[PDB]
Amino acid sequence: GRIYAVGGYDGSPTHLNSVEAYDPETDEWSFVAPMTTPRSGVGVAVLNGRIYAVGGYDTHLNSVEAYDPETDEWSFVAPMTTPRSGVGVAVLNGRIYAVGGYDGSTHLNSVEAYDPETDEWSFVAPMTTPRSGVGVAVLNGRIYAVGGYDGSHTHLNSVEAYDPETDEWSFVAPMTTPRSGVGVAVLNGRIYAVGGYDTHLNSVEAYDPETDEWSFVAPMTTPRSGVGVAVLNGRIYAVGGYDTHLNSVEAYDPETDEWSFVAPMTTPRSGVGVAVL
Ligand SMILES: [Ca+2]
Ligand SMILES: [Ca+2]
Ligand SMILES: [Ca+2]
Ligand SMILES: [Ca+2]
Numbered sequence: 001g002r003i004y005a006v007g008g009y010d011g012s013p014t015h016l017n018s019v020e021a022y023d024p025e026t027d028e029w030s031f032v033a034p035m036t037t038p039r040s041g042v043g044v045a046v047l048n049g050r051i052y053a054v055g056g057y058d059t060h061l062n063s064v065e066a067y068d069p070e071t072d073e074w075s076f077v078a079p080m081t082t083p084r085s086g087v088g089v090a091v092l093n094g095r096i097y098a099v100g101g102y103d104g105s106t107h108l109n110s111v112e113a114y115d116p117e118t119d120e121w122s123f124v125a126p127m128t129t130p131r132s133g134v135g136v137a138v139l140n141g142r143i144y145a146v147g148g149y150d151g152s153h154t155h156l157n158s159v160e161a162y163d164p165e166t167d168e169w170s171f172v173a174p175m176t177t178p179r180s181g182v183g184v185a186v187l188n189g190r191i192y193a194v195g196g197y198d199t200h201l202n203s204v205e206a207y208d209p210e211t212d213e214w215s216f217v218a219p220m221t222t223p224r225s226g227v228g229v230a231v232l233n234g235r236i237y238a239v240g241g242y243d244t245h246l247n248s249v250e251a252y253d254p255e256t257d258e259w260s261f262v263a264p265m266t267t268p269r270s271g272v273g274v275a276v277l
Contacts, residue, residue, distance in 0.1 A: 129148075143161065
């Protein structure tokens with residue numbers, strides 16, 4: 001029942017290990033325990049009652065830290081094989097998938113899956129297009145890799161969908177606007193691609209997998225690339241990003257098609273990871 005904003009970069013007048021938690025019922029952000037390693041461009045996902053902070057840039061990181069909210073403690077888990085900043089992370093069928101990113105130790109099309117029951121990462125099928133700054137979300141039994149930057153030199157509007165049952169990636173319909181550093185979340189049977197960089201974007205596009213179509217929805221007030229996006233209590237929250245490095249937070253209600261500001265974080269954060277637990 002909280003949104004966690006994990007790491008990022010405070011470029012206001014620092015790569016962050018700090019973590020803030022938002023309670024929608026009180027409209028308040030509070031600091032929790034910080035991660036060991038500072039991470040900007042970090043991917044964050046939730047599995048089996050832990051937040052996982054995957055990769056990022058401190059050195060480009062293959063390390064992964066897990067947070068237990070019941071104890072307010074972080075601990076390292078097994079590292080990925082490939083270092084990845086600008087990585088997208090999502091959870092499907094009991095695995096965390098780390099998708100793409102940049103290995104500054106290559107823009108990556110490789111994908112690694114983590115099983116918490118074995119504490120092991122393995123490679124699965126790679127995407128067709130390398131993607132750093134990619135948004136990843138899960139809907140109807142597929143992982144969608146949305147946008148990003150292929151520097152193997154294009155900002156991408158293309159979108160690939162992964163089926164774990166076949167271990168295959170397939171292209172779906174592309175977004176209208178190319179978006180790197182895009183935030184992606186899922187609500188009411190649609191994938192929302194929020195902000196990013198084409199021009200720093202306040203526009204938002206929604207994908208219906210049943211029709212294979214993207215449509216624009218209401219734009220955010222503030223343009224945000226490097227934005228973190230998560231879903232809680234029937235709203236999409238767009239957290240931080242770079243317009244100014246932002247500590248502001250906007251909430252989208254799909255039933256009204258409106259964005260509004262909520263309480264800002266204490267620390268401005270671009271390249272921030274955001275998950276709900
Ligand atoms: Ca509550
Ligand atoms: Ca527990
Ligand atoms: Ca299992
Ligand atoms: Ca299936």
